[PDB]
Design an enzyme around this catalytic site. Structure first.
Site, PDB file in Angstrom:
ATOM      1  N   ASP A   1      85.997  35.193 -20.627  1.00 33.93           N
ATOM      2  CA  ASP A   1      85.756  33.781 -20.956  1.00 33.93           C
ATOM      3  C   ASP A   1      86.507  32.842 -19.598  1.00 33.93           C
ATOM      4  OD1 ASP A   1      85.409  31.881 -23.369  1.00 33.93           O
ATOM      5  OD2 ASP A   1      87.379  31.243 -22.476  1.00 33.93           O
TER       6      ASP A   1
ATOM      7  N   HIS B   1      81.006  30.013 -20.375  1.00 33.19           N
ATOM      8  CA  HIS B   1      81.946  29.235 -21.260  1.00 33.19           C
ATOM      9  C   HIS B   1      81.259  29.209 -22.228  1.00 33.19           C
ATOM     10  CE1 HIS B   1      79.338  25.824 -19.130  1.00 33.19           C
ATOM     11  NE2 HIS B   1      79.637  26.972 -18.268  1.00 33.19           N
TER      12      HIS B   1
ATOM     13  N   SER C   1      85.892  27.284 -28.548  1.00 36.46           N
ATOM     14  CA  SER C   1      87.154  26.868 -28.167  1.00 36.46           C
ATOM     15  C   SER C   1      88.579  26.552 -28.276  1.00 36.46           C
ATOM     16  CB  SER C   1      86.603  25.502 -26.713  1.00 36.46           C
ATOM     17  OG  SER C   1      85.124  26.147 -26.115  1.00 36.46           O
TER      18      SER C   1
HETATM   19  O1  LIG Z   1      85.296  26.127 -21.920  1.00 33.14           O
HETATM   20  C1  LIG Z   1      85.306  24.660 -22.154  1.00 33.14           C
HETATM   21  C2  LIG Z   1      86.967  24.972 -22.585  1.00 33.14           C
HETATM   22  N1  LIG Z   1      87.217  24.201 -23.279  1.00 33.14           N
HETATM   23  C3  LIG Z   1      88.478  24.623 -24.791  1.00 33.14           C
HETATM   24  O2  LIG Z   1      88.715  23.405 -25.326  1.00 33.14           O
HETATM   25  C4  LIG Z   1      89.593  25.442 -24.498  1.00 33.14           C
HETATM   26  O3  LIG Z   1      89.491  25.791 -25.095  1.00 33.14           O
HETATM   27  C5  LIG Z   1      90.972  26.229 -25.470  1.00 33.14           C
HETATM   28  C6  LIG Z   1      91.540  26.563 -26.359  1.00 33.14           C
HETATM   29  C7  LIG Z   1      93.129  26.512 -27.459  1.00 33.14           C
HETATM   30  C8  LIG Z   1      94.077  25.759 -26.943  1.00 33.14           C
HETATM   31  C9  LIG Z   1      93.139  24.879 -25.907  1.00 33.14           C
HETATM   32  C10 LIG Z   1      91.453  25.152 -24.957  1.00 33.14           C
HETATM   33  C11 LIG Z   1      86.385  22.947 -23.934  1.00 33.14           C
HETATM   34  C12 LIG Z   1      85.417  22.829 -23.054  1.00 33.14           C
HETATM   35  N2  LIG Z   1      84.423  23.141 -22.709  1.00 33.14           N
END
Ligand SMILES: O=C1CN(C(=O)COc2ccccc2)CCN1
Ligand SMILES: *[C@@H]1O[C@H](CO)[C@@H](O)[C@H](O)[C@H]1NC(C)=O
Length: 342
Positions: free
Chosen positions: A242, A288, A145
């Site tokens: 995603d 996710h 993420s």
């Molecule tokens: O699916 C998820 C989403 N999450 C994330 O960090 C999203 O990914 C990003 C990547 C880059 C910038 C902002 C967000 C964590 C929690 N579970």
């Protein structure tokens, strides 16, 4: 179990000024080192960060961290759970900087919070060199993420750091999970990243910075734009549908024609951005789920699991018969791959 070590350099801090750190489990019979970056969104101004401090404080502070954590998925030491790298030295780096691992700014009289993600990675690497990393053959910088985007922003800096410190034999590589996003039109985000970079004093890889120039560094947070500028080998894992991409696109799943076309076009665009990425795993699933989950071995593309594809990637860095490394689904709708998670 991986054991917590707070950084010995207490000036490298989480958002609230508490020391950053890492969890470590050593494997003295192995020259492989896995350094995993945690994710969890980000914050981009005083008011938004204050809210995160009230209800997501473990992502902003080390004061309440536990002394141990269990390694799961690619961080597991059991062969049945981790066919890829079960015997490796394992490191989990908590995300406590709220800056997509890009920041280099300390708390001061003019800054309520510190944003030091890029410096945290550098200091973890430096302190590990005295604990066995000096003898490594491969350092795999992995993350999920916001941590997956963090891999893309930091892998070449780690390679340069080890070269300048006098360790040219350590091969640095990256594994970016669920951090490859599109700056597309919503069904009904780039501004938040632009504001964040200024708030964090965020840094991006130098070749990408030189392409996009001043004021446009936000472009380097998008995988398809930063990946071609990188020199270290990087393996990309990304669901074609995603859930975080769909969230920022204002999609929440009886689907009518307009939304059907939107979802199909998104999968096609993601597939297109991966065409020239030779090491990649991109299943046609709405999810996710991330690579530190215990059942990460279950999903397959074209009959090949992710642990297998990563093993084939290792072999390629010494095409291979029966050992593929480029695995992107071509079917056009979520769960057209039968092995998608539930
Ligand atoms: O699916 C998820 C989403 N999450 C994330 O960090 C999203 O990914 C990003 C990547 C880059 C910038 C902002 C967000 C964590 C929690 N579970
Ligand atoms: C601690 O880290 C900071 C930030 O990287 C650096 O300026 C300082 O020199 C470090 N201290 C030591 C003793 O290495």
């Amino acid at each position: 179990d991986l054991r917590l070590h707070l950084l010995l350099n207490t000036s490298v801090t989480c958002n609230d000024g508490s020391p950053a750190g890492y969890y470590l489990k050593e494997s003295r019979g192995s020259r492989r080192w896995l350094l995993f970056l945690e994710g969890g969104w980000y914050c981009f101004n005083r008011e938004n960060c204050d809210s995160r401090y009230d209800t997501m404080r473990r992502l902003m502070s080390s004061r309440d961290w536990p002394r141990t954590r269990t390694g799961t998925g690619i961080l597991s030491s059991q062969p049945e759970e981790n066919p890829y790298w079960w015997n490796a030295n394992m490191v989990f780096i908590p995300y406590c900087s709220s800056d997509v691992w890009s920041g280099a700014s300390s708390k001061s009289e003019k800054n309520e919070y510190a944003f030091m993600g890029a410096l945290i990675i550098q200091e973890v690497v430096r302190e590990l060199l005295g604990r066995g990393l000096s003898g490594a053959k491969v350092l795999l910088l992995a993350g999920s993420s916001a941590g997956g985007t963090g891999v893309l922003l930091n892998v070449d800096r780690v390679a340069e750091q080890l070269e300048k410190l006098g360790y040219p034999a350590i091969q640095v590589r990256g594994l970016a999970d669920s951090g490859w996003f599109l700056d597309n039109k919503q069904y009904r985000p780039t501004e938040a990243i632009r504001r964040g970079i200024r708030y964090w004093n965020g840094v991006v890889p130098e070749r990408c910075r030189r392409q996009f120039q001043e004021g446009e560094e936000w472009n380097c947070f998008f995988g398809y734009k930063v990946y071609p500028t990188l020199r270290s080998p990087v393996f990309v894992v990304q669901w074609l549908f995603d859930e975080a991409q769909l969230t920022v696109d204002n999609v929440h799943l009886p689907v009518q024609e307009g939304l059907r076309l939107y979802i199909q076009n998104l999968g096609r665009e993601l597939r297109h951005t991966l065409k020239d990425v030779p090491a990649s795993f991109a299943p046609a699933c709405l999810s996710h789920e991330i690579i530190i989950r215990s059942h990460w071995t279950d999903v397959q593309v074209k009959g090949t699991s992710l642990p297998r594809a990563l093993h084939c990637w290792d072999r390629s860095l010494h095409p291979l018969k029966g050992c593929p490394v480029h695995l992107v689904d071509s079917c056009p709708w979520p769960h057209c791959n039968p092995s998608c998670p539930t």
